[PDB]
Amino acid sequence: EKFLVIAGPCAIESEELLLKVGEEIKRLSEKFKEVEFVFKSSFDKANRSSIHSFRGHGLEYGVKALRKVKEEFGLKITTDIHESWQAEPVAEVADIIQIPAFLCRQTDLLLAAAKTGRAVNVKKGQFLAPWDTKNVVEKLKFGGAKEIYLTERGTTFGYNNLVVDFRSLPIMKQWAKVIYDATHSVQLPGGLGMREFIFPLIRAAVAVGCDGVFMETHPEPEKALSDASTQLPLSQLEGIIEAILEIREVASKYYETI
Amino acid sequence: KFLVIAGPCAIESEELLLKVGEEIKRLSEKFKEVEFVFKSSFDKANRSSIHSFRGHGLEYGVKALRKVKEEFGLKITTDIHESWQAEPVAEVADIIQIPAFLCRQTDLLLAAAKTGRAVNVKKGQFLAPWDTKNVVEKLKFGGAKEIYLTERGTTFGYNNLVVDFRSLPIMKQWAKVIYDATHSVQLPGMREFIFPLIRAAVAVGCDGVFMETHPEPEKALSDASTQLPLSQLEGIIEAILEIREVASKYYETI
Amino acid sequence: EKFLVIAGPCAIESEELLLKVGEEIKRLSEKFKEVEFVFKSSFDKANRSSIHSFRGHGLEYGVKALRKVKEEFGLKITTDIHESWQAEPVAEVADIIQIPAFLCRQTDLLLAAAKTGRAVNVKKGQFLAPWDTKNVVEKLKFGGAKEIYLTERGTTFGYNNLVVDFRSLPIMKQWAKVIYDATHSVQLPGGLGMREFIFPLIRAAVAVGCDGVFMETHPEPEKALSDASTQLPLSQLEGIIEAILEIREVASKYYETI
Amino acid sequence: KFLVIAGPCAIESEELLLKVGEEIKRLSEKFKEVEFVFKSSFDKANRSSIHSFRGHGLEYGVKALRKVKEEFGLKITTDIHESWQAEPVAEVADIIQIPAFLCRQTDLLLAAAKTGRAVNVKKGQFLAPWDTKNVVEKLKFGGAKEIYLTERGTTFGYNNLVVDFRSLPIMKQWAKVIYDATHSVQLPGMREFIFPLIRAAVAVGCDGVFMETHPEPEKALSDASTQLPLSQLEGIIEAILEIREVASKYYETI
Ligand SMILES: O=P(O)(O)OC[C@@H](O)[C@@H](O)[C@H](O)CO
Numbered sequence A, C: 001e002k003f004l005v006i007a008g009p010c011a012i013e014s015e016e017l018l019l020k021v022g023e024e025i026k027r028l029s030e031k032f033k034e035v036e037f038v039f040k041s042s043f044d045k046a047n048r049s050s051i052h053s054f055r056g057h058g059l060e061y062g063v064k065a066l067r068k069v070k071e072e073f074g075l076k077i078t079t080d081i082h083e084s085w086q087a088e089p090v091a092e093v094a095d096i097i098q099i100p101a102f103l104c105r106q107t108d109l110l111l112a113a114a115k116t117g118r119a120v121n122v123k124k125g126q127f128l129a130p131w132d133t134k135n136v137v138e139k140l141k142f143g144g145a146k147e148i149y150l151t152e153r154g155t156t157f158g159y160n161n162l163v164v165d166f167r168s169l170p171i172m173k174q175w176a177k178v179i180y181d182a183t184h185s186v187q188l189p190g191g192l193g194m195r196e197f198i199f200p201l202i203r204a205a206v207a208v209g210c211d212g213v214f215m216e217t218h219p220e221p222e223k224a225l226s227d228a229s230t231q232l233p234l235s236q237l238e239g240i241i242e243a244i245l246e247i248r249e250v251a252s253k254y255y256e257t258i
Numbered sequence B, D: 001k002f003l004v005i006a007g008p009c010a011i012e013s014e015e016l017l018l019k020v021g022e023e024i025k026r027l028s029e030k031f032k033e034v035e036f037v038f039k040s041s042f043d044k045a046n047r048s049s050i051h052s053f054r055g056h057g058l059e060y061g062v063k064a065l066r067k068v069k070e071e072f073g074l075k076i077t078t079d080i081h082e083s084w085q086a087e088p089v090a091e092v093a094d095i096i097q098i099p100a101f102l103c104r105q106t107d108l109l110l111a112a113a114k115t116g117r118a119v120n121v122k123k124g125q126f127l128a129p130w131d132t133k134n135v136v137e138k139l140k141f142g143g144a145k146e147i148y149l150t151e152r153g154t155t156f157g158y159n160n161l162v163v164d165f166r167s168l169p170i171m172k173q174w175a176k177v178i179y180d181a182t183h184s185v186q187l188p189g190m191r192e193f194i195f196p197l198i199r200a201a202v203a204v205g206c207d208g209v210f211m212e213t214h215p216e217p218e219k220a221l222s223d224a225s226t227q228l229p230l231s232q233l234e235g236i237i238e239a240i241l242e243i244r245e246v247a248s249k250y251y252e253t254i
């Protein structure tokens, strides 16, 4: 099956930033034809720790910006919603509606996404056990979703630290397609993220076996308005993708059947 | 004075609320050294299963809660799940409760603070004690003045929560601290640990306790494995007041 | 039942240090007649993180030092063993033989302690669940122990941090007398301990209900050769003990029956 | 070259060791790019229950291990539990293994290093990756030169272990890192996760893998729920070599 790579800048800092990243993603999509790319960026960071941190430029602006990417590059789009009313307007441009990790159990949000007819990707709550995502998929299927994704993004391990229990990939694979979040799984919740572990954990994810990877990328991570410690420099994206396809290929014959 | 927030988990019917309201009203008359707050949810917006009881809706709920406040003169508190609910709920709720999973949702916190009512934030199972300083800052920025932080356990492996009582003194630096005696022992819950841990909460030091109670916990449509039997409420309250009276002499300053 | 207070300097820095602490413990034992005191100190810190840290002056020296305390003050004695051969010689002076937390599952060490006829106190491993101590008691009873204690000293919570799950006290009470370690439960494993939490957690322990408390105390913690961040200043011991007896008394009528 | 440490959990009989030794000897001939080490414990000194199988003693064990090294010319490794055992065990064991619970016992580490043999320390379930730097220092101080640190999971709530693969690159700064594929999935263990995680171990990067194997894992007197079936060993080895060959191009330096 075609491997999914969901990538893009964490936040929609500007339509310019999006075009620059989309251009590179478009180029890579032409090179890695066996990969299905999906451009990602949030119109709002509705859960920042601090009230003084960057949130965004509003839903209206973001959807317009994302639509420009899809139009100019012909790329699939995904972004996250935070309250039920946002699903409808977002569904106009988003091919995949993303459900934030903290909100993975909010019934109305999941139902709002499911009825749009779009694909839904739920980030696994840092508080949720692998086997507890079964009910999450049941809610989505009940709400009309026909294409569902579950994203591994780490689990609460003591304070201000997350650990990735890779046993979760085959467990979740039982009821949904699984995506590995390479950049948020190494972040330190309220710490201020460890970038040196992004690549190795990604290798692990593909050797274990998943249906795709989620990576936040920015031309200059050091200048990002969000996740400046975890976003991957855009120049490194090509090499990372090439590496996971290679590892995925050689490990593929050993993937267990669910 | 010491705060005691109690009531049934979900508004199963205004009937149920009135019955519990009666008992809470009685205790209220018996323990003048305690500020009682009637609590109940108009919607269980985060059940694990789509096939579980959620409730009768916001209007039926705000209605029944109005009936309790008017028939017993008790303060009220219930939780909101989306920004638009803050305003209508603030009509009856003296304290607006923010769900644990939603403690980082900026707009929800701001919407709550905007109503001018008191705000109680359940500490997320993913949050470290010191991470709550930022939750309070948001509320203050939003105009909130009476702010509460509730301890309800922290993620400890899978399907288990642990109470790190170091959290009470830490959170107290920036807000009044409430201990959730019923949800802190639930397994994402042995009722046998409810009383022992509430005793610890008061020996350590907190500004109030949160307890879900029901005439017949087993028949409850929600948290049936942890809701405290109504008849046991008085006994526990008297016990925590006695322990608090003695232990308060040693509560550390700030 | 008579409340147990196990206290003393972490390590046997010198026989002088022991006499100074024992003198104060002896004085307190005369004041708090409803308490059963047991003087504690280790002749060896066999599990320090660093090879350059203080271990002790040997078994021979320590046993002699402890015997001096028991002789000069008439106090019960307890110290920990690290290998089977030490039980016999230690049993000569120790009323209670202590089993280190990391060694709570070493069968021969437990059996070695049990056959001396002395009381045995096992520090609960930071890796052990409350209900798993049942087998630990079974091993001791099998080995001849007739007076067994289980000590709560925290559980691994992420890296370099321990949390105390107070549900463990009533659980362990089902098969042994339970002791709460007030000073090691707030230490940060390999961190360099948070002294400001010692007192509040002790209040919690007695309000929940336990059969005794374990506290390391030193005249000048800042100068200790071990646990300088967790040892309680000897001047504060009297007040702490008075406080727990008061809290224990008022909470006592509510202790659940096992 | 890549290290593969394998054998039955406990020395149930020199008979069992010889059978497994035969298969390991065969793989040894088939995979020259791999250094195989035969492993088995003469004593299970830390069983939870007093009524569980421990073994046949140190002499019967060191004897049977001698038979394997002499009949197949394989390197040997077994674990010690008290200082006095280092010397007699060093007679046959090429690598002395230090139990996870005992990774902080200074005298045991020193006793092992004193023999002059290689030393493999199982990382305690209570230890953080960076805390192993001190474990190595002790060994070096004791005269050890060939030092190994084995990843075997970390305490995650109760009765569960999680593998934080960030530990492999961290521990590599001061020692050769081995991944314990069988004990890392055991619940203080679904065999279904053994292969997937070993694949991750090699994709991430390690110097060898540790695997307990038995002709009939179910009949094993120890770790019966996690011991890998002897027949599946070859397949897994070939798989990790292939993955390693491809992934090694991306292993980070130091
Ligand atoms: O405000 P801070 O704590 O930096 O958090 C931001 C990240 O957690 C955020 O971008 C993420 O995708 C949402 O949780």
Ligand SMILES: O=P(O)(O)OC[C@@H](O)[C@@H](O)[C@H](O)CO
Binding pocket: C010, C045, C047, C048, C049, C050, C053, C184, C189, C190, C226, C227
């Ligand atoms: O060597 P460090 O890490 O300071 O450790 C010492 C304490 O953990 C020690 O005194 C304790 O009683 C034994 O584990």
